[PDB]
Amino acid sequence: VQLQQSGAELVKPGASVKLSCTASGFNIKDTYMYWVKQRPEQGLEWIGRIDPANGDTKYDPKFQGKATITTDTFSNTAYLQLSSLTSEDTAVYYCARKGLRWAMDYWGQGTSVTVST
Amino acid sequence: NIVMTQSPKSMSMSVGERVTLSCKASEYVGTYVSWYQQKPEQSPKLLIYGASNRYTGVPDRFTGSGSATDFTLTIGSVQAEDLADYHCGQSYSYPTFGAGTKLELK
Amino acid sequence: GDVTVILNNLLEGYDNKLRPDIGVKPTLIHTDMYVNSIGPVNAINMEYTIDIFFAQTWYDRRLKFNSTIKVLRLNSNMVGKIWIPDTFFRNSKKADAHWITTPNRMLRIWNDGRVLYTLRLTIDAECQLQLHNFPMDEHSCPLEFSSYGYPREEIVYQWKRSSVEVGDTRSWRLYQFSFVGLRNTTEVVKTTSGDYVVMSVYFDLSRRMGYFTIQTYIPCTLIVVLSWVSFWINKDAVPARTSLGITTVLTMTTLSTIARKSLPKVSYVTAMDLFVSVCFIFVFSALVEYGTLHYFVSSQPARAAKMDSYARIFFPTAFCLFNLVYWVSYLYL
Amino acid sequence: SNMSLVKETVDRLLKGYDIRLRPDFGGPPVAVGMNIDIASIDMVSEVNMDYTLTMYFQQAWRDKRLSYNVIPLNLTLDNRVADQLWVPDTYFLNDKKSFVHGVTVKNRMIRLHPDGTVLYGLRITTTAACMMDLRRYPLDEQNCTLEIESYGYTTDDIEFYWRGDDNAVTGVTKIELPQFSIVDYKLITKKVVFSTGSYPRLSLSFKLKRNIGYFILQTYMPSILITILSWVSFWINYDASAARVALGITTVLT
């Protein structure tokens, strides 16, 4: 029904970030939860998805090992942790859920991480 | 990794005329192509779920046309609020999106 | 919530052993079909398979409820709890419903008591095929149904205006036949138990000669043309011409047997064994012509010289005239 | 109304009804009358030594427990009530595989009459077995019958007869067999004796006569023509040895 994300992050290159996506209006054990990234003036890029009822996770080949997606069922929350992010992944990170014909019908609000010194 | 190629990368067109956007897949994607709309500084909105099925709350001017590899998104009377990005994405495999198309007004 | 209350109230004081209006009037049942496919029409056992979605609809004043919902859409779970007509197919040798993964039945009850009951069936119906003019024949053989226990005074059937609908007709299992049309029919039949309203659907089929052509008509004609080549060989090579004559007869017999095995063991002559019989007569005639030639070359060579020159023009002309008359006479019919 | 009357009548008829006991369980035997409406005779197989026939098989008897007088009409009931009534345990002695059709429901009929007469019809496809004497094949006529007997009830508990005794079996003159032709049929009533008692038996026999048009054209015409083509070697002179030998040898082989 609605997905609410946290605010923007301003972190230093070489650290780890943890983004959150809280779901309100439904149980996350019924659908999948997707994380998508979007750079300024470019197309969307799929990071990975997690099956919260099982714990099974899949990742994009350009993101395997970098990002890790976890879930907290008791509060209907999906977490995305980036391990060691360099000076190029300054994008907007969207949290989505699967819809009717495997589409992403509900999206979050975007979390713009920023890496600088 | 199924690659979706969207064309054109940027276009302009006036108000109240039919417009057609195209998405081409490298591999087979049955009817699992979706069309999202993204206005500036906002999250994408699902317009067309599946090939040729409108989402709840979408006007009757958007319509999709599907195949095994070729997909189109057609708008009829295009208004002045359709100044946004349009992405095509497949869901037959792990989801991949297109490059995007910026609709403009003239 | 409320649908459970409605379903439990419909089944209170309900007797599924009695049709609606059991002593008032006959029940009118509207029937529809949807042919998914017409299976192989083998003429050996005089039958054909068909797969349909058979839908019946009638009025039951006991399944009448007052509510804000207009229609109850149910599974096959409640089919055995209300009255269902005992429709049966009169010309079926074998017929079964479908049960995978759950019994393929549908029940829908409306606000005013109108019940619609649909189920998927695969029927192996029988139709006696008058196999004359085979294989350039056309048949029209039916699928009939009626009630089993309820006579005309208890159950009356009636088609709708969009009764029977076929699908794409290309995904059907008709190899040797081709669907061309259909027509519905209603009648009353006298039976030892009473008069029954019987409804028939006649499917008209025409056999496509694309298999029988390259199965028998092309090889038999080829064997005849083969037997023809014996005339151009010199009359002194006796084993050569003898071998030509006997092998063509052999091959014609083999072809006649393998072609007869297609259709059942009917006692009449068809349009295909007539063809193979005339071809057999042609090969046999070639052999007997060579026989009389070899017999006559010793008595007088002056008479036996132009026999082969006569045969070389008489056999192809006679065969072509036979083919002309046969094909015209059997495609005009 | 009429629905309430019929409902309470059927509910009274089936209340306290013992399906284990036949009508007049201690008294005289019950008489069951048979009708057969033959829909088709499918395949008379000489290799399996059997024949297949579809029939509308109807039985009529009189059960005093199913008697009513408040309504003036005959009651055709939904076929599921045939499992709550006593029906005779008729079987076919010379069958190999039988079944009742089951589309769209179980193809059977149960009808009650106000005087107690029960009418019970089934639609059966029987593969009955008959041994054929093929010593005159294919110029033979085969006489094989279908036996109708009662399994459990002896001749002092049940009694069989044909309902009409001459018109009880119909639809035999309309049967179109591709290889045979029905010439005559007979209905017989008798009693058989087994080690457990004496049982009534009915017998429906169809004398079939085989056509000859197929056997002539597929077998007798080829053999005669091959014999004629064996005669043709006499018009070949005795010099050409290869020709007559080849013609004769391949004629023998054919």
Add this chain to the structure above:
Amino acid sequence: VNMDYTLTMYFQQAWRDKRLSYNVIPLNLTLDNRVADQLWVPDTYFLNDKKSFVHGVTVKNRMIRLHPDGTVLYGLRITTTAACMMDLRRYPLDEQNCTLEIESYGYTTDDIEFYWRGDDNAVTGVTKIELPQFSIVDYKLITKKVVFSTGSYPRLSLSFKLKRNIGYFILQTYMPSILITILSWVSFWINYDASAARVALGITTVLT
């Protein structure tokens, strides 16, 4: 041609049910085979079968047997058409290996455990099997755990290795073909002047 084999077996299962435990009477109880519709019996199935049935003559050929400590024995008489894929690259000089897979459908490996009762004497009656074409050379019993998308399930496997006999195939196909090849050599013993004889002989042997 169907890539299957039919086998009839007495298939018995034994487990222990703490609810079917009695101590008033001292003997083992063989009950009528219709009380097995009121007890819990495992939902065992054969993964590689195509059609199977329990014999139902004169009644359903199944056995239930209780024991005073709680042990339940449950036997069936099953004729099953199990699918076995053959490798016919060496036919008829071949040795096949095909199986009967015995698995639990509903209960995973943390709900049920399969094992051979005896582990070497669990399968009997193999040495008394006479086949018209094959000959049982060896048989093996295997315990295993398979993994599907729903869980991990226990599995037993009974495998036979069957060696096809050769004498039939020798006298039926290898010997006639060798005989035709011997026959096609009498074409050289005929003199090269007579042409029709050698052509007829060689052509009929190649055609045969």
Add this chain to the structure above:
Amino acid sequence: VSDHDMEYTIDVFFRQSWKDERLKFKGPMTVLRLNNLMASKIWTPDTFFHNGKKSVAHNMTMPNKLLRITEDGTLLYTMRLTVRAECPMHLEDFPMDAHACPLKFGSYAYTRAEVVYEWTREPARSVVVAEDGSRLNQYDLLGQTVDSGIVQSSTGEYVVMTTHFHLKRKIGYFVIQTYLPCIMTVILSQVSFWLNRESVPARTVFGVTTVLTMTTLSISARNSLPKVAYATAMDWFIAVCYAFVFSALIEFATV
């Protein structure tokens, strides 16, 4: 009797009698001839056929079962059923072989200390075959032979009632089918010895076509016969006949 499946079919009235003291009654009748649905509410023995393949218990038009209770507690329970049983045959002397097709039955799950079987009359007069009851085309039923023994399986010792039906194959079909074409082909190959040596192709096609016909006959005769490992008597006859034909051809070659 199917020879390619090594099985046979039989149709029987199978009667079993026993005594249940719980079913004693006293009424105006001394025997209750009840339906076939009362038998499913009482204990009936679970007899199965040890060598059955796919048997059927007929239930047309009703379950062909019989229950009679006598007032002292004795029950007679009869069924009508078609049994398809296994008959392991040894086909050395085919088609002049005699077999004893068995039919073994006993109780499933009831051992010797619980249920024992017995013939109700003298064992030579228990299994009774009807006179018109013979659907044998190829065999001849000579007699029957009953027996009783104790088999032992992984669940205990059971009583087994065995019946043997002695069959003697009729040769009149295989004679005309194989023995006359083989002897005819041998004689027809020996016909060539009366031809003049000036005709080489004639005697050549004689010999080779009789060798071909012998090959065809052996293949045809063996396709009806199952895929046994040994050689039958007809196979020995065909082999000797083939030897005669081949020797005739080699003799022509030598001449």
Add this chain to the structure above:
Amino acid sequence: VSDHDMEYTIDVFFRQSWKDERLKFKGPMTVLRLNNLMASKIWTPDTFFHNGKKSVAHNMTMPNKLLRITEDGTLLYTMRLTVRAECPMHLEDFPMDAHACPLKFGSYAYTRAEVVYEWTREPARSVVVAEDGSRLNQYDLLGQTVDSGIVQSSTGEYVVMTTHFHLKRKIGYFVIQTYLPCIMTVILSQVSFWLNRESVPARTVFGVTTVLTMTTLSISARNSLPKVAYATAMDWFIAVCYAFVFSALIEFATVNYFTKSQPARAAKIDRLSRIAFPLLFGIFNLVYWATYLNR
């Protein structure tokens, strides 16, 4: 895959999962792995196969069904069954043809506004064929292909899930059965051109037995394939080979007829046709195999 019946067989674990808020519980276990006789007391979807002919659901030894109820109300329901489905085939390039055998399933009695279907995982990974799971003798499974759509029936709109299995027929059997004997018969017919012109019965029986062989070949090769009403690739091959054999016999007839009147012409036509026939047959073989292997 039964080619003569236009059908195929497939043994599947068929799994369905939905959410029933009436089957919520709270106990020590979070998932009840129940029996196959509890699934008859509750609601289960009535999925049927749109192109299934006569499918079976195994009942050995117990009903091969599976019911799992999760604590929050989710139900997993699995069946094991053998679908016998319909595969419409276009046998125009037989036996060098490829097919896509479908398996359409949907809901009977439940329209799109009541029951919708969806794949539980990614659509490319939902239908999973096992590795040793191949009972194919004549075909080669290349991959699978799923789809979902809506059909408009007389009673409403229904969701239909389609699955295509792509098959490619293996030609190795048909080579030895038809393509090798036909080529061998053509060679056996063409070998007659090397015999001298003075042995006319010899070359006659050569030609005639090759014609007999080609006829028996066409019959034996046609009885395998079902009785379709058009010409396949094997039919065209047999027709051209029959033409070559018959043409060879006609050439022999011409050579024999031209003997004793013009010996030089007969010699010329026997020397010219000794090399034109293998050349023409090789060009036909090259063209045929090139157009039907790259097809």
